[PDB]
Design a protein around this ligand. Sequence first.
Ligand SMILES: [Zn+2]
Ligand SMILES: [Zn+2]
Ligand SMILES: [Zn+2]
Length: 178
Amino acid sequence: NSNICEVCNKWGRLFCCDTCPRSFHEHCHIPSVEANKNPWSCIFCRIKTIQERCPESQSGHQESEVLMRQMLPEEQLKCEFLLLKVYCDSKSCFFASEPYYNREGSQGPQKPMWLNKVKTSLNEQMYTRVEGFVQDMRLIFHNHKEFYREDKFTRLGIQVQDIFEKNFRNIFAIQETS
Ligand SMILES: [Zn+2]
Ligand SMILES: [Zn+2]
Ligand SMILES: [Zn+2]
């Protein structure tokens, strides 16, 4: 197994996957690493099994059809994995916890949103369709863009949104376009 957390890249109290060499902090894995379960398989492993069981699940899909999907167990898992892929970027720190807004010339967003709130919402099964989760994720970056205006700090929202969007297209096998 690796000697660092796959998500945050630090050592510590790590739980090792039984089917691949990754390790995790307890609350870095999504969902949080399960109490018992020997062998234990990480989210990466569980996603790869889905693909192996249904190779046609990798054929291209339309984003509009993906969004309307109900959050059955396989879609729940895919959204957890996509959330986890965002936390894997170190720049996710800026978007993890509850923000506050007091900048000359700007007003805070009407609907603040942050990664740990999305994580809670997934854990609590509050999204009934893929669209719910994707809307809250894109709201994070849109609020950041609007608040920071011409400050160069706006670029951190562009960067982390690009990681979200590339991983969304991969995980949900969105049809490639020009
Ligand atoms: Zn970690
Ligand atoms: Zn694994
Ligand atoms: Zn199949």
